[PDB]
Amino acid sequence: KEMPQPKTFGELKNLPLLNTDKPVQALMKIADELGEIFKFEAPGRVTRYLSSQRLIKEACDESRFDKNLSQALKFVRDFAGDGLATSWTHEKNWKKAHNILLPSFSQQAMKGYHAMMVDIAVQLVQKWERLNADEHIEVPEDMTRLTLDTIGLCGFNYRFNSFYRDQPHPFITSMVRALDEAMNKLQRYDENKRQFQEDIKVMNDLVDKIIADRQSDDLLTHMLNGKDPETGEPLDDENIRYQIITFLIAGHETTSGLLSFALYFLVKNPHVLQKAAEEAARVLVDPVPSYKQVKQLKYVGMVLNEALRLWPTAPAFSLYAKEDTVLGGEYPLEKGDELMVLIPQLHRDKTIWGDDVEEFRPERFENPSAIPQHAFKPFGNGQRACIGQQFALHEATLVLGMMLKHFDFEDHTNYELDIKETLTLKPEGFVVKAKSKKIPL
Amino acid sequence: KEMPQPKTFGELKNLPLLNTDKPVQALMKIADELGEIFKFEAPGRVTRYLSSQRLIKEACDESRFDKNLSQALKFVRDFAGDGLATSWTHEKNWKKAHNILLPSFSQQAMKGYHAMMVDIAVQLVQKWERLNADEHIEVPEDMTRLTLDTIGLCGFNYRFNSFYRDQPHPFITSMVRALDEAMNKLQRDENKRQFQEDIKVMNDLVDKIIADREQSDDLLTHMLNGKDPETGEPLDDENIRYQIITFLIAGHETTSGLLSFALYFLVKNPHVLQKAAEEAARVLVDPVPSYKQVKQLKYVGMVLNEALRLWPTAPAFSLYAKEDTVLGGEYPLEKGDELMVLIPQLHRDKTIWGDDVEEFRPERFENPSAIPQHAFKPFGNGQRACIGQQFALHEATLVLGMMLKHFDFEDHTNYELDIKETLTLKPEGFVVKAKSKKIPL
Ligand code: HEM
Ligand code: HEM
């Protein structure tokens, strides 16, 4: 009945607990201390952080809870607009864009993106093939180069050419700085405001120019030529721009974090790495992986799912109660009460996964049938789940599969896991050496 | 390219090689002579027996190979119907029953079965506690009493009361006779009448029990109230009867073999027995083991896995190629070509386990990541893997843990391993003496 609550800060209540550079991990330690649910209060804000599958399976009842825009999503909405990720379910543009964009994100649609994914993946492999001896790989940086370029290429046929850059493309600097200012608003400036508005324009300018500039096998074509079957309407240019920005943000950093965490866990678990490398070598028999071959990388996907279990890179999503309801038979929620799903804690629910929740064992996912309902939510829930899941998983499987095929990896620094937190999670400073296996492309 | 083949018998080809009372062991010796794969020909039948992890890891690719009904499963289907074990993957009732029954077989579901498992396990312990001096235990017999009663109780809330019997319950007598006739058809009018009499005896009780069935914590409840999420449809009563029969076959005989082989290997490896006994004594601190305590019986679980390695009691499963495919880069298979996975041979692949493949070393399973992919398939593969695996392992871990806690065991006859072969494997005539440790329940 009585809901736990972490330490308060007088008038600021719990909000200064988010005044930290690792708020998800701070929220996880609070959840470790307080359990499956704890009230988090701030001035003018009350939310509840769910950490058990028991409560989250109820939160994932779409008849009772709908996606809420967390404060982070509302700040991302300042430039992602009514794009898919930052729109309310009841906004016309969500379901409209959902229906228009769902076919271009199916498992059937990955066949058309695969060649462009391979394009960037080959650039990643070639970059590492071209490293000198004792030179190392900055993993999250290269993973971000790879995923951002992949979504740029697969999304609207735009080459950010991140592997040709030290400082990212001006759009990327603005997007990250806009995302940074959005996150700093959580923890919370006239200069930051002007910069944010400048970064919004930089982002808008490039996308709207690309929408104006633009048939290819990319999301942009589907958004210009796609009609929502329901309303019969195509997305207007403004929403198309919000979707591209949405896809640029949503589709690069969570996927790079997953790859970066996957490789981190691979180099920390040589048995898993060997097992995944053996599959990559066995399955990727061609110089260029095919779509079908990426599907055969079962264990690689198992590695990716276990990396998503330990560190879901989009580490939370928000829900609101559509009507007065009771959560778990002891937490009454009024209409509009907000819930936060602490995904990394959910994925450490010992009552679901056993006591070895902190162990990286992809064998947990050997049979996806053994996973209870709503125990594993790295891609959100229901109709508001990640539309790019298949895209992210296909890209990450392909790229990790190519990485494992072409290189032996060394944790040469014995890297101490340091999870930098933006709105996503990444192992900061994670560096490896890759000894090429000298397998041509 | 050319596939080895064991000796032929003219028009009967290889089939008379199965006219033997230990055909798996005959197939293993053939595999020892011919290697990782050999063609097995019969009138109107060609199959290939795989024995290496190298080929079986490919056979376990579900995109290329699906479960085939072996001739044994086709004969078991004559009374197990389209139950889970004897249905094709493409049969609507498989995935339907698979989806409905999967939650009632999860590791999360074992918490609710645990009390009934303890119920039968205590009955086993009490039987041995009540043995007089110099009286011995007929191990597979008592293990079958335990596993049959456990699946009867956990599955349908029906007490076979096998520990109150010398001659098994009439359903079990008919089932064993039915499985025998099913196996005897492999080696090949009164049989048929007898085979039909055993089917009717099995159907009548189950359909009665299904008709008689109150809400219980059993599989029958879940099957009566469970809806397939996919089709929204519940299992019809006919399939429920097939599932109960399936669980009555599948749910005990392989598990009793595992317990019997586990204890056989423990009394043949006193250090392993001591180590497992010490863990049982350390972990099982209560008179009644808890679910959590059974999970802490790591070495006992490792003991069971190594017993399943040496003698997987479901010793084979059949696969067919869904499309034209190449096995191991040198054995072209056409669409519908059949594969048999000779599991005990797989589990003796020296390239996986080392030269000591024949040794009972439970330590091989301390880390499941250090085991190559598809090297260990005692519970089948993929979506057609054993749905009762966690059930079998939890029951066997609990029961073996209680056995190790409550008794010192003596291989008083220096029992010579004699493996009776039905459709499962059991150490026939395996007898032990148990000196009670006088630890109350
Ligand atoms: C490992 C990689 C990824 C992870 C962990 C991830 C995670 C998530 C999560 C948890 C949500 C739910 C957000 C919420 O409920 O507030 C979401 C939504 C979304 N994601 Fe992803 N995502 C990944 C990759 C991608 C990619 C590659 C794309 C695009 C190419 C993408 C586009 C989207 C969109 C558009 C939504 C909103 C869907 C809707 O509300 O209709 N994501 N993602
Ligand atoms: C040590 C004990 C056990 C072993 C070694 C074992 C082994 C296996 C194997 C190898 C398969 C695959 C069959 C094939 O592919 O043709 C299988 C399937 C199956 N087993 Fe088990 N089993 C055990 C215990 C159990 C228990 C306790 C249950 C039920 C309570 C059970 C029920 C089933 C079912 C229903 C299937 C078919 C699943 C499907 O195809 O959807 N088994 N088992």
DSSP A440: -
Alpha-carbon distance of A107 to A295, in angstroms, equals: 10
Alpha-carbon distance of B384 to A33, in angstroms, equals: 40
3-state secondary structure chain B: CCCCCCCCCHHHCCHHHHCCCCHHHHHHHHHHHHCCEEEEEECCEEEEEECCHHHHHHHCCCCCEEEECCHHHHHHHHHHCCCCCCCCCCCHHHHHHHHHHCHHHCCCCHHHHHHHHHHHHHHHHHHHHCCCCCCCEEHHHHHHHHHHHHHHHHHHCCCCCHHHCCCCCHHHHHHHHHHHHHHHHHHCCHHHHHHHHHHHHHHHHHHHHHHHCCCCCCHHHHHHHCCCCCCCCCCCHHHHHHHHHHHHHHCCHHHHHHHHHHHHHHHHCHHHHHHHHHHHHHHCCCCCCCHHHHHHCHHHHHHHHHHHHHCCCCCEEEEEECCCEEECCCEEECCCCEEEEEHHHHCCCHHHHCCCCCCCCHHHHCCHHHCCCCCCCCCCCHHHCCCCHHHHHHHHHHHHHHHHHHEEEECCCCCCCCEEECCCEEECCCEEEEEECCCCC
How is residue A285 written in tokens? 């028999």
Q: Which residues contact B126 (CB under 8 A, 6 or more apart)?
A: B441
Alpha-carbon distance of A245 to A80, in angstroms, equals: 6
Q: Chain A: nearest CA to B309, how far in angstroms?
A: 18
- Is residue A313 flagged as an active site residue? no
Determine the distance separating the centroid of ligand 1 and the alpha carbon of A213, expressed in angstroms.
27
Q: Which residues contact B237 (CB under 8 A, 6 or more apart)?
A: B207, B210
Kindly list the distances between the CA atom of residue A2 and the CA atoms of A38, A152, A195, A384, B208, in Å, as whole numbers in the listed order.
Answer: 10, 48, 44, 30, 48
Contacts by residues A11-15 (CB-CB < 8 Å, ≥ 24 positions apart): A11/A43, A12/A42, A12/A43, A13/A41, A13/A42, A13/A43, A14/A40, A14/A41, A14/A42, A15/A41, A15/A42, A15/A43, A15/A45
Alpha-carbon distance of A53 to A36, in angstroms, equals: 8
3-state secondary structure of A39: strand
CB atoms near residue A286 (< 10 Å): 9
From the list A386, A407, A409, A430, the catalytic residue is A386
Cα–Cα nearest to B308, from B262, B357, B349: B262
Alpha-carbon distance of B246 to B249, in angstroms, equals: 5
Alpha-carbon distance of B35 to B5, in angstroms, equals: 10
Contact between chains at A354 and B98 (C-beta distance less than 8 A): no
Kindly list the distances between the CA atom of residue A320 and the CA atoms of A47, A48, A94, in Å, as whole numbers in the listed order.
Answer: 9, 10, 17
Alpha-carbon distance of B300 to B407, in angstroms, equals: 15
Ligand 2 mutation target, pool B310, B379, B394, B400, most atoms within 8 A of CB:
B379
Q: Quick one: CA torsion of A29, A34, A35, A39, rounded to 10 degrees?
A: -100
Alpha-carbon distance of A165 to B212, in angstroms, equals: 73
Which run of H or of E encompasses A396? helix A389-406
Residue with tokens 């988090």: A40
Ligand 1 mutation target, pool A386, A395, A398, A399, most atoms within 8 A of CB:
A386
Cα–Cα nearest to A143, from A390, A436, A434, A359: A434
Domain residue ranges in chain B: 1-441
Which run of H or of E encompasses A435? strand A431-436
DSSP A166: S
Alpha-carbon distance of A116 to A220, in angstroms, equals: 14
Alpha-carbon distance of A383 to B271, in angstroms, equals: 55
Q: Can you say whether the dihedral through the CA atoms of B165, B169, B175, B178 is positive or negative?
A: positive
How is residue B88 written in tokens? 């094709």
Are the C-beta atoms of B159 and B152 separated by less than 8 Å? yes
Alpha-carbon distance of A432 to A263, in angstroms, equals: 9
CA atoms within 13 A on the CB side of B160: 29
Alpha helical stretches, state H, A21-163 = 23-34, 53-59, 71-80, 92-101, 110-129, 139-156
Q: Which residues contact A183 (CB under 8 A, 6 or more apart)?
A: A72, A75, A421, A422, A423
How is residue B398 written in tokens? 């609990």
Provide φ and ψ at A406, rounded to 5°: -95, -15
Q: How far apart are the first and last CA of chain A?
A: 60
Burial of A440 (0-12, 13-18, 19+ CB in 10 A): exposed
Alpha-carbon distance of B216 to A260, in angstroms, equals: 47
Are the C-beta atoms of A380 and A392 separated by less than 8 Å? no
CA atoms within 13 A on the CB side of B433: 10
CB atoms near residue B208 (< 10 Å): 11
Which run of H or of E encompasses A431? strand A431-436
Ligand nearest to the CA of B313: 2
Q: How far apart are the first and last CA of chain B?
A: 61
Cα–Cα nearest to B310, from B271, B258, B270: B258
Are the C-beta atoms of B399 and B410 separated by less than 8 Å? no
- Is residue A386 flagged as an active site residue? yes
In angstroms, what is the resolution? 2.1
Are the C-beta atoms of B431 and B412 separated by less than 8 Å? yes
Interface test with A, best of B55, B94, B294, B373 (most A CBs within 10 A): B373
Q: Can you say whether the dihedral through the CA atoms of A117, A120, A125, A128 is positive or negative?
A: negative
Are the C-beta atoms of A338 and A318 separated by less than 8 Å? yes
How is residue B193 written in tokens? 């009448």
Which residues of chain A have a CB within 8 Å of the CB of B378?
Answer: none
Which run of H or of E encompasses A207? helix A190-213
Alpha-carbon distance of A83 to B17, in angstroms, equals: 67
Burial of A42 (0-12, 13-18, 19+ CB in 10 A): middle
Kindly list the distances between the CA atom of residue A30 and the CA atoms of A12, A24, A49, B137, in Å, as whole numbers in the listed order.
Answer: 17, 10, 10, 53
Alpha-carbon distance of B335 to A314, in angstroms, equals: 42
Q: Can you say whether the dihedral through the CA atoms of A216, A219, A222, A223 is positive or negative?
A: negative
Q: Which residues contact A406 (CB under 8 A, 6 or more apart)?
A: A125, A128, A129, A434, A436, A437, A439, A441
Alpha-carbon distance of A15 to A187, in angstroms, equals: 7
Are the C-beta atoms of A365 and A305 separated by less than 8 Å? yes
CB of A363 less than 8 A from some CB of B: yes
Q: Given the DSSP bridges, would you call strands B407-410 and B431-436 parallel, antiparallel or unpaired?
A: antiparallel
User: Which atom from ligand 1 is nearest to the alpha carbon of A395?
Assistant: 27
Residue with tokens 């679910």: B291
How is residue B57 written in tokens? 């890891």
How is residue A17 written in tokens? 């607990």
Q: Chain A: nearest CA to B106, how far in angstroms?
A: 6
Cα–Cα nearest to B38, from B2, B9, B1, B4: B4
Provide φ and ψ at A338, rounded to 5°: -100, 140
From the list A254, A313, A325, A424, the catalytic residue is A254
Please name the amino acid found at residue B392.
A
Contact between chains at B369 and A275 (C-beta distance less than 8 A): yes
Q: Given the DSSP bridges, would you call strands B338-342 and B45-50 parallel, antiparallel or unpaired?
A: parallel
CB of A271 less than 8 A from some CB of B: yes
Kindly list the distances between the CA atom of residue A339 and the CA atoms of A56, A67, A202, A384, in Å, as whole numbers in the listed order.
Answer: 9, 9, 34, 15
A154 is an annotated ligand-binding site residue: no
From the list B246, B254, B325, B397, the catalytic residue is B254
Alpha-carbon distance of A69 to A81, in angstroms, equals: 12
